């Protein structure tokens, strides 16, 4: 915030605004990238009340209302994975809440309705009669649903069980997630400890040049400083953009995964 | 807002415009609280000045002062100061202090620091590199020979602040202690040490008051920062004067005078933003405060912070505007009201172990799809560009090299990449086709 | 005589708290696996900066002469010791047989494992702890004082239980700074390719 | 035209006309085998009935509402036009490219005249002003803005055109699957189940004109997830059984046409009693 610094900014006209418009043009694509992976039907839906599930067991992926009202699995997803200053964090339009509602919605009808409610409005079915379609869309003939009912149950509502085992027991897949709140972290942290780089200054830190320097010696370190702390700025923007584009084809990939995946079933193999 | 986006008409939107900061309210200087005054007494007035060869040197220790002052006395005849910022003299505390006393040809006043045309500094009174100080002189009569010395030669320059101890070219002008460039010149330099540690002997200033809770600039001994004075609820090592952040900046200030651990808070910076509908809609605007809590900034806060000018409202609507943590905002029935947003309609779906439903009817619904295919294929030359193509410019363009050509280059690969995108796209079709009439 | 102490001889680096962090640091330390000479009146070489130990509760061990050349007759430093209400001088000495000038600076402040390290201008670390051939354990030594006092220091002696013996070396090291920002562990960065 | 420059396209404005032209007319007169490689003529009303096939509702359903689809569509179209005519901000995208465009080169052109800390940023001037003795300095600062600016704005454009790319990728993606096909997957043509869509031109850009079916009005019935019949479980070849209340049919996923369940749309699959919440009924026997 010092003016005599931002007297000598100006000499580089446009930088400074030209980075925040490249964040915010970021930060508008992280609300977008959670809005189209999300937000892909344009309504909640309630869970229903009674759980005649055909013998499947949702209740760990599902709310509890006790909870934020996320799933038991979310939970875990929360718990293990893990600055202040020019650097801000700014919050999701979609608050983890309504994240956990939008999840619970989309879930709700991938529950409730199968793929319908990606093309219309949900479409409600039973459970059992879901998965019969499910096993048809693999060239599974719909009897062997039946035919192994409450067997297929206990093995989908057992490999549920050891989910749960395999995320309470280790974060390791979570280490996916866990890396890009790394990579920030290391990004931000070293964008901050470029500000007690030197770059061949008498001083990394302004205010000690601005205490040891008269203006017209200052200048002549404060142009190095700046030229130094805004050439690493624009360095870890061109990373944060990279990473961006990284993660909006990571987000557009989601999102079909998404489209395909849960609103409908891929036949696309792996 | 119009101002920032360079319109006499901004679209419906928000914008980021700033960054409020709560301003610091108070400017704040301590130290320990110094009991003495820089004694110059056992220097400035000394019976004896040595032979520069083996200046005299005493300690200036527990000081408060403007540190010009000896501008004030009668018996100095110059007072001049080297070149390294001179009015910072009376800036932060200093922790280490000398007077440093010795006799000279008065021309030689000109010859106490090293790469000058200097007979006195290299082989005699050899400052360190960085160290600060000031020399102040006169002719011998103002206080009290041929003994007087100082040292031709040495076979190269001799160690900072020091004297090579040993049984030699000595010379002394038109020396007695009652006689400017022949005259025996009494000296007294002040050398200050370069240190950070706390206070020892500073400025004019003293130890304001400790104004906790405040946001405020300050600095204690030298330990300048700008903050809430938020006290801690931490412990240091008894040595320990301040501390640092997981993200290495000052966390924390001990009271340069007491146990006081503080420890700081940010003064509070907050995003500004303008929510707006289009300005030929309205010139009604409300105001967003990123992070901040609704202090001292209709008025409402939000987990993103407060806000001014929107007006709450509990009904939940499509996000007209976002806000962020939820809340979105819309000009209407008129005012910009704000609101925690719709994640659409609700909808108990009418679940059973035997509900079905089945569309009846359908809609064909065309719907645009807008998809980007290339840039402009922009081109450009770094010479015609950085230089004009001037010659005179173009040779130094050249002493930085390949950088041209690879830009030029990389602008080349998009504009053949914008033909290629096109084709990848449109030319599918080999042949063209042409649409019965 | 001899033992791998391994660990001990630490000392604060700053008067910078910290909590419950890794820190990364460089200056003169003791290079970890501390084979250090074990004494039970000599006089030794100096070199990069000195850690001494003392084991004593006889308090027999009294102190050292660091400098040039020790014995009176020019300057060269000397301490001696009690808890911490040292005294300590660089003049031309002289010495009492059986106890049980040019003064530039003068100065007044088994089972006791006293720790000791010097360095450069000059600066001194300590610690006092507890025992019941330097043991393998753990210590960190606060930075008790700072010392403008321009001696040549390049050699030292011991005046008087048993003591031993390490030089610095300049090396990169890391400390785990704990809920009091107290220096709990710490890693040799050259030590081996795991502490590295 | 300051040392900046824009290149025509090989393909300008009126050949991509054309080029989209060709795509249309295959996309109307062939259908998706113009893409594999000839470009076999189709009647369109065929190419609708194959399209509603592959969103499993049957082409049969196509002709019983033959005008009835074509008047939604042209209507849909007609809305087109007018969501077009009224809304500018429709373009969001096309205009934004081109608006980020246009702010690069007028932030490089703005980072023309910034000083970067020499005495000028007109070059002219320290070339009217001074000797090279000084004006190399003054210069190699300028050159050192104008050179960051330009690597800098490079790397904007780079990032921006590997967004671009992505985005024609996918474009071509669309046309290839979109266009050139029928996309199965859901939601890759936009909402509904996809049948088709048309390809048309704009300054740097396209505009895809999905043609999704959405299921709109519907009926509450009640359904079995199998039927007895013989103590033998019968279940449908394809679609799915429901009651209205008092009778049993099968009817497709997609739209509501009931059927009576017979041994011509349905497979036997063993005994009852491995199903939960199978129901009894009369299947008949042609
Ligand atoms: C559905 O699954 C949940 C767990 O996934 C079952 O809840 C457990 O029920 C037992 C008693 O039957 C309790 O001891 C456990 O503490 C419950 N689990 C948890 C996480 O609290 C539930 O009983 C299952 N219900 C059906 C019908 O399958
Ligand atoms: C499907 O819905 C459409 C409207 O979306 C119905 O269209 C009407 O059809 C009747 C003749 O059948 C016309 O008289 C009306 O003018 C039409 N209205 C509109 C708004 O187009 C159509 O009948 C429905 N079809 C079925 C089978 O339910
Ligand atoms: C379920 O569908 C059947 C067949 O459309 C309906 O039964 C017909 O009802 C009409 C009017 O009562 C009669 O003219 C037909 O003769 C009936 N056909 C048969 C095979 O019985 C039945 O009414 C429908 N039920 C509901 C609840 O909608
Ligand atoms: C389907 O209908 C059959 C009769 O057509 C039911 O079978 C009877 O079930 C009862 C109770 O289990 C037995 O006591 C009878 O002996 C059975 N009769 C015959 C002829 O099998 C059957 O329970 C019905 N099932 C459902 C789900 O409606
Ligand atoms: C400051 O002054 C007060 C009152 O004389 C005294 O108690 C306190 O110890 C002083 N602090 C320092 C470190 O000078
Ligand atoms: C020395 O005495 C003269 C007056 O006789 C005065 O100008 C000078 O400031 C004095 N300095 C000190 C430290 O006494
Ligand atoms: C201003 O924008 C509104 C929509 O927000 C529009 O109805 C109106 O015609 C516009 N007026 C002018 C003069 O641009
Ligand atoms: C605002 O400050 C008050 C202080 O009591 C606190 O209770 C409240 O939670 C704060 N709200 C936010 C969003 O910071
Ligand atoms: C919102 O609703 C609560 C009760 O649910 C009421 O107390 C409050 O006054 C309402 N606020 C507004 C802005 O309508
Ligand atoms: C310590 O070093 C000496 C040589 O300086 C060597 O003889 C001895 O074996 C070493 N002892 C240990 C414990 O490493
Ligand atoms: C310091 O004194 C010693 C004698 O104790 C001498 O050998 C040495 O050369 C001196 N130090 C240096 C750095 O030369
Ligand atoms: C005192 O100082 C002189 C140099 O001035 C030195 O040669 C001599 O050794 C010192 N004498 C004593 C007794 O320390
Ligand atoms: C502490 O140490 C020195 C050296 O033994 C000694 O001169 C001093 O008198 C001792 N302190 C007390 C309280 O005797
Ligand atoms: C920190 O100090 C407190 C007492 O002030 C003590 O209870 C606590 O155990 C200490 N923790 C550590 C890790 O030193
Ligand atoms: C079906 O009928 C019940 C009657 O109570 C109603 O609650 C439910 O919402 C209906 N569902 C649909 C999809 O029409
Ligand atoms: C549906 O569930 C209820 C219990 O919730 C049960 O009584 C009924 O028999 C079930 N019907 C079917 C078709 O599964």
Same mark, same amino acid.
């Given at each position: 915030?010092?003016?005599?610094?931002?007297?000598?900014?100006?000499?580089?006209?446009?930088?400074?605004?030209?980075?925040?418009?490249?964040?915010?043009?970021?930060?508008?694509?992280?609300?977008?990238?959670?809005?189209?992976?999300?937000?892909?039907?344009?309504?909640?839906?309630?869970?229903?009340?009674?759980?005649?599930?055909?013998?499947?067991?949702?209740?760990?992926?599902?709310?509890?209302?006790?909870?934020?009202?996320?799933?038991?699995?979310?939970?875990?997803?929360?718990?293990?994975?893990?600055?202040?200053?020019?650097?801000?964090?700014?919050?999701?339009?979609?608050?983890?809440?309504?994240?956990?509602?939008?999840?619970?919605?989309?879930?709700?009808?991938?529950?409730?309705?199968?793929?319908?409610?990606?093309?219309?409005?949900?479409?409600?079915?039973?459970?059992?009669?879901?998965?019969?379609?499910?096993?048809?869309?693999?060239?599974?003939?719909?009897?062997?649903?039946?035919?192994?009912?409450?067997?297929?149950?206990?093995?989908?509502?057992?490999?549920?069980?050891?989910?749960?085992?395999?995320?309470?027991?280790?974060?390791?897949?979570?280490?996916?997630?866990?890396?890009?709140?790394?990579?920030?972290?290391?990004?931000?942290?070293?964008?901050?400890?470029?500000?007690?780089?030197?770059?061949?200054?008498?001083?990394?830190?302004?205010?000690?040049?601005?205490?040891?320097?008269?203006?017209?010696?200052?200048?002549?370190?404060?142009?190095?400083?700046?030229?130094?702390?805004?050439?690493?700025?624009?360095?870890?923007?061109?990373?944060?953009?990279?990473?961006?584009?990284?993660?909006?084809?990571?987000?557009?990939?989601?999102?079909?995964?998404?489209?395909?995946?849960?609103?409908?079933?891929?036949?696309?193999?792996? | 807002?119009?101002?920032?986006?360079?319109?006499?008409?901004?679209?419906?939107?928000?914008?980021?415009?700033?960054?409020?900061?709560?301003?610091?309210?108070?400017?704040?200087?301590?130290?320990?609280?110094?009991?003495?005054?820089?004694?110059?007494?056992?220097?400035?007035?000394?019976?004896?000045?040595?032979?520069?060869?083996?200046?005299?040197?005493?300690?200036?220790?527990?000081?408060?002062?403007?540190?010009?002052?000896?501008?004030?006395?009668?018996?100095?005849?110059?007072?001049?100061?080297?070149?390294?910022?001179?009015?910072?003299?009376?800036?932060?505390?200093?922790?280490?202090?000398?007077?440093?006393?010795?006799?000279?040809?008065?021309?030689?006043?000109?010859?106490?620091?090293?790469?000058?045309?200097?007979?006195?500094?290299?082989?005699?009174?050899?400052?360190?590199?960085?160290?600060?100080?000031?020399?102040?002189?006169?002719?011998?009569?103002?206080?009290?020979?041929?003994?007087?010395?100082?040292?031709?030669?040495?076979?190269?320059?001799?160690?900072?602040?020091?004297?090579?101890?040993?049984?030699?070219?000595?010379?002394?002008?038109?020396?007695?202690?009652?006689?400017?460039?022949?005259?025996?010149?009494?000296?007294?330099?002040?050398?200050?040490?370069?240190?950070?540690?706390?206070?020892?002997?500073?400025?004019?200033?003293?130890?304001?008051?400790?104004?906790?809770?405040?946001?405020?600039?300050?600095?204690?001994?030298?330990?300048?920062?700008?903050?809430?004075?938020?006290?801690?609820?931490?412990?240091?090592?008894?040595?320990?004067?301040?501390?640092?952040?997981?993200?290495?900046?000052?966390?924390?200030?001990?009271?340069?005078?007491?146990?006081?651990?503080?420890?700081?808070?940010?003064?509070?910076?907050?995003?500004?933003?303008?929510?707006?509908?289009?300005?030929?809609?309205?010139?009604?605007?409300?105001?967003?405060?990123?992070?901040?809590?609704?202090?001292?900034?209709?008025?409402?806060?939000?987990?993103?912070?407060?806000?001014?000018?929107?007006?709450?409202?509990?009904?939940?609507?499509?996000?007209?505007?976002?806000?962020?943590?939820?809340?979105?905002?819309?000009?209407?029935?008129?005012?910009?009201?704000?609101?925690?947003?719709?994640?659409?309609?609700?909808?108990?779906?009418?679940?059973?172990?035997?509900?079905?439903?089945?569309?009846?009817?359908?809609?064909?619904?065309?719907?645009?799809?807008?998809?980007?295919?290339?840039?402009?294929?922009?081109?450009?030359?770094?010479?015609?560009?950085?230089?004009?193509?001037?010659?005179?410019?173009?040779?130094?363009?050249?002493?930085?090299?390949?950088?041209?050509?690879?830009?030029?280059?990389?602008?080349?690969?998009?504009?053949?990449?914008?033909?290629?995108?096109?084709?990848?796209?449109?030319?599918?079709?080999?042949?063209?086709?042409?649409?019965?009439? | 005589?001899?033992?791998?102490?391994?660990?001990?001889?630490?000392?604060?680096?700053?008067?910078?708290?910290?909590?419950?962090?890794?820190?990364?640091?460089?200056?003169?330390?003791?290079?970890?696996?501390?084979?250090?000479?074990?004494?039970?009146?000599?006089?030794?070489?100096?070199?990069?900066?000195?850690?001494?130990?003392?084991?004593?509760?006889?308090?027999?061990?009294?102190?050292?002469?660091?400098?040039?050349?020790?014995?009176?007759?020019?300057?060269?430093?000397?301490?001696?010791?009690?808890?911490?209400?040292?005294?300590?001088?660089?003049?031309?000495?002289?010495?009492?047989?059986?106890?049980?000038?040019?003064?530039?600076?003068?100065?007044?402040?088994?089972?006791?494992?006293?720790?000791?390290?010097?360095?450069?201008?000059?600066?001194?670390?300590?610690?006092?702890?507890?025992?019941?051939?330097?043991?393998?354990?753990?210590?960190?030594?606060?930075?008790?004082?700072?010392?403008?006092?321009?001696?040549?220091?390049?050699?030292?002696?011991?005046?008087?239980?048993?003591?031993?013996?390490?030089?610095?070396?300049?090396?990169?090291?890391?400390?785990?700074?704990?809920?009091?920002?107290?220096?709990?562990?710490?890693?040799?960065?050259?030590?081996?390719?795991?502490?590295? | 035209?300051?040392?900046?420059?824009?290149?025509?396209?090989?393909?300008?404005?009126?050949?991509?006309?054309?080029?989209?032209?060709?795509?249309?007319?295959?996309?109307?007169?062939?259908?998706?085998?113009?893409?594999?490689?000839?470009?076999?003529?189709?009647?369109?009303?065929?190419?609708?009935?194959?399209?509603?096939?592959?969103?499993?509702?049957?082409?049969?359903?196509?002709?019983?509402?033959?005008?009835?689809?074509?008047?939604?569509?042209?209507?849909?179209?007609?809305?087109?036009?007018?969501?077009?005519?009224?809304?500018?901000?429709?373009?969001?995208?096309?205009?934004?490219?081109?608006?980020?465009?246009?702010?690069?080169?007028?932030?490089?052109?703005?980072?023309?005249?910034?000083?970067?800390?020499?005495?000028?940023?007109?070059?002219?001037?320290?070339?009217?002003?001074?000797?090279?003795?000084?004006?190399?300095?003054?210069?190699?600062?300028?050159?050192? =803005?104008?050179?960051?600016?330009?690597? %800098? $704005? +490079?790397?904007? *454009?780079?990032?921006?055109?590997?967004?671009?790319? /992505?985005?024609?990728?996918?474009?071509?993606?669309?046309?290839?699957?979109?266009?050139?096909?029928?996309?199965?997957?859901?939601?890759?043509?936009?909402?509904?189940?996809?049948?088709?869509?048309?390809?048309?031109?704009?300054?740097? =850009?396209?505009?895809?004109?999905?043609? %999704? $079916? +959405?299921?709109? *009005?519907?009926?509450?019935?009640?359904?079995?997830? /199998?039927?007895?019949?013989?103590?033998?479980?019968?279940?449908?070849?394809?679609?799915?059984?429901?009651?209205?209340?008092?009778?049993?049919?099968?009817?497709?996923?997609?739209?509501?046409?009931?059927?009576?369940?017979?041994?011509?749309?349905?497979?036997?699959?063993?005994?009852?009693? +491995?199903?939960?919440?199978?129901?009894?009924?009369?299947?008949?026997?042609?």
């Amino acid at each position: 915030d010092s003016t005599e610094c931002s007297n000598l900014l100006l000499q580089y006209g446009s930088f400074c605004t030209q980075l925040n418009r490249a964040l915010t043009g970021i930060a508008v694509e992280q609300d977008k990238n959670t809005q189209e992976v999300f937000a892909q039907v344009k309504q909640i839906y309630k869970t229903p009340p009674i759980k005649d599930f055909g013998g499947f067991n949702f209740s760990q992926i599902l709310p509890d209302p006790s909870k934020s009202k996320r799933s038991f699995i979310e939970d875990l997803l929360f718990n293990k994975v893990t600055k202040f200053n020019g650097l801000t964090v700014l919050p999701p339009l979609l608050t983890d809440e309504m994240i956990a509602q939008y999840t619970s919605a989309l879930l709700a009808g991938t529950i409730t309705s199968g793929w319908t409610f990606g093309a219309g409005a949900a479409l409600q079915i039973p459970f059992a009669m879901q998965m019969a379609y499910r096993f048809n869309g693999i060239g599974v003939t719909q009897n062997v649903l039946y035919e192994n009912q409450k067997l297929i149950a206990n093995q989908f509502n057992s490999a549920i069980g050891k989910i749960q085992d395999s995320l309470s027991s280790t974060a390791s897949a979570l280490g996916k997630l866990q890396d890009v709140v790394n990579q920030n972290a290391q990004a931000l942290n070293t964008l901050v400890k470029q500000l007690s780089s030197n770059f061949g200054a008498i001083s990394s830190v302004l205010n000690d040049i601005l205490s040891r320097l008269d203006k017209v010696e200052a200048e002549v370190q404060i142009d190095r400083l700046i030229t130094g702390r805004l050439q690493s700025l624009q360095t870890y923007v061109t990373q944060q953009l990279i990473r961006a584009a990284e993660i909006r084809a990571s987000a557009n990939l989601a999102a079909t995964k998404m489209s395909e995946c849960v609103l409908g079933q891929s036949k696309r193999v792996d | 807002t119009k101002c920032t986006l360079k319109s006499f008409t901004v679209e419906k939107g928000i914008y980021q415009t700033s960054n409020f900061r709560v301003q610091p309210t108070e400017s704040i200087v301590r130290f320990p609280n110094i009991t003495n005054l820089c004694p110059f007494g056992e220097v400035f007035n000394a019976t004896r000045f040595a032979s520069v060869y083996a200046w005299n040197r005493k300690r200036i220790s527990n000081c408060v002062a403007d540190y010009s002052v000896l501008y004030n006395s009668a018996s100095f005849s110059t007072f001049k100061c080297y070149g390294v910022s001179p009015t910072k003299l009376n800036d932060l505390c200093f922790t280490n202090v000398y007077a440093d006393s010795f006799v000279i040809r008065g021309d030689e006043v000109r010859q106490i620091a090293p790469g000058q045309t200097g007979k006195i500094a290299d082989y005699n009174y050899k400052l360190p590199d960085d160290f600060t100080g000031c020399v102040i002189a006169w002719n011998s009569n103002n206080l009290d020979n041929y003994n007087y010395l100082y040292r031709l030669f040495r076979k190269s320059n001799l160690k900072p602040f020091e004297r090579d101890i040993s049984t030699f070219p000595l010379q002394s002008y038109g020396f007695q202690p009652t006689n400017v460039g022949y005259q025996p010149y009494r000296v007294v330099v002040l050398s200050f040490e370069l240190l950070h540690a706390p206070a020892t002997v500073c400025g004019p200033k003293k130890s304001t008051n400790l104004v906790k809770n405040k946001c405020v600039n300050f600095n204690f001994n030298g330990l300048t920062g700008t903050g809430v004075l938020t006290e801690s609820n931490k412990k240091f090592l008894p040595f320990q004067q301040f501390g640092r952040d997981i993200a290495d900046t000052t966390d924390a200030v001990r009271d340069p005078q007491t146990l006081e651990i503080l420890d700081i808070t940010p003064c509070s910076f907050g995003g500004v933003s303008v929510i707006t509908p289009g300005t030929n809609t309205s010139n009604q605007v409300a105001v967003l405060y990123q992070g901040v809590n609704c202090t001292e900034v209709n008025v409402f806060q939000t987990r993103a912070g407060c806000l001014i000018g929107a007006e709450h409202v509990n009904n939940s609507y499509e996000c007209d505007i976002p806000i962020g943590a939820g809340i979105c905002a819309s000009y209407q029935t008129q005012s910009i009201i704000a609101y925690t947003m719709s994640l659409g309609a609700e909808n108990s779906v009418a679940y059973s172990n035997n509900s079905i439903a089945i569309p009846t009817n359908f809609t064909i619904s065309v719907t645009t799809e807008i998809l980007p295919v290339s840039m402009t294929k922009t081109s450009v030359d770094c010479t015609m560009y950085i230089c004009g193509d001037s010659t005179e410019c173009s040779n130094l363009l050249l002493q930085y090299g390949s950088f041209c050509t690879q830009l030029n280059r990389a602008l080349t690969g998009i504009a053949v990449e914008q033909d290629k995108n096109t084709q990848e796209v449109f030319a599918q079709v080999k042949q063209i086709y042409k649409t019965p009439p | 005589a001899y033992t791998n102490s391994f660990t001990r001889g630490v000392y604060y680096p700053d008067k910078v708290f910290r909590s419950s962090v890794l820190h990364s640091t460089q200056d003169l330390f003791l290079p970890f696996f501390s084979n250090v000479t074990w004494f039970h009146n000599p006089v030794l070489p100096f070199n990069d900066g000195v850690y001494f130990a003392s084991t004593e509760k006889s308090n027999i061990i009294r102190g050292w002469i660091f400098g040039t050349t020790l014995d009176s007759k020019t300057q060269s430093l000397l301490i001696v010791n009690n808890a911490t209400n040292v005294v300590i001088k660089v003049c031309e000495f002289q010495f009492c047989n059986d106890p049980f000038n040019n003064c530039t600076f003068e100065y007044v402040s088994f089972k006791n494992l006293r720790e000791f390290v010097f360095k450069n201008y000059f600066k001194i670390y300590s610690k006092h702890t507890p025992i019941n051939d330097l043991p393998q354990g753990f210590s960190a030594l606060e930075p008790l004082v700072d010392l403008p006092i321009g001696i040549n220091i390049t050699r030292f002696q011991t005046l008087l239980a048993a003591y031993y013996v390490g030089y610095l070396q300049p090396r990169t090291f890391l400390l785990k700074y704990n809920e009091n920002g107290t220096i709990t562990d710490a890693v040799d960065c050259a030590l081996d390719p795991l502490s590295e | 035209f300051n040392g900046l420059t824009v290149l025509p396209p090989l393909l300008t404005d009126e050949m991509i006309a054309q080029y989209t032209s060709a795509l249309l007319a295959g996309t109307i007169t062939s259908g998706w085998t113009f893409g594999a490689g000839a470009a076999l003529q189709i009647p369109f009303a065929m190419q609708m009935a194959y399209r509603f096939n592959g969103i499993g509702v049957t082409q049969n359903v196509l002709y019983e509402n033959q005008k009835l689809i074509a008047n939604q569509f042209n209507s849909a179209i007609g809305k087109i036009q007018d969501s077009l005519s009224s809304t500018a901000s429709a373009l969001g995208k096309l205009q934004d490219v081109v608006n980020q465009n246009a702010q690069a080169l007028n932030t490089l052109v703005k980072q023309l005249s910034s000083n970067f800390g020499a005495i000028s940023s007109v070059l002219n001037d320290i070339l009217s002003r001074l000797d090279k003795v000084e004006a190399e300095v003054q210069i190699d600062r300028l050159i050192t =803005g104008r050179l960051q600016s330009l690597q %800098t $704005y +490079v790397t904007q *454009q780079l990032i921006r055109a590997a967004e671009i790319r /992505a985005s024609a990728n996918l474009a071509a993606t669309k046309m290839s699957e979109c266009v050139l096909g029928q996309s199965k997957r859901v939601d890759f043509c936009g909402k509904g189940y996809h049948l088709m869509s048309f390809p048309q031109s704009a300054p740097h =850009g396209v505009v895809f004109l999905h043609v %999704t $079916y +959405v299921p709109a *009005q519907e009926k509450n019935f009640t359904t079995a997830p /199998a039927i007895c019949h013989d103590g033998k479980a019968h279940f449908p070849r394809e679609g799915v059984f429901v009651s209205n209340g008092t009778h049993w049919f099968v009817t497709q996923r997609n739209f509501y046409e009931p059927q009576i369940i017979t041994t011509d749309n349905t497979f036997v699959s063993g005994n009852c009693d +491995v199903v939960i919440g199978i129901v009894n009924n009369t299947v008949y026997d042609p």
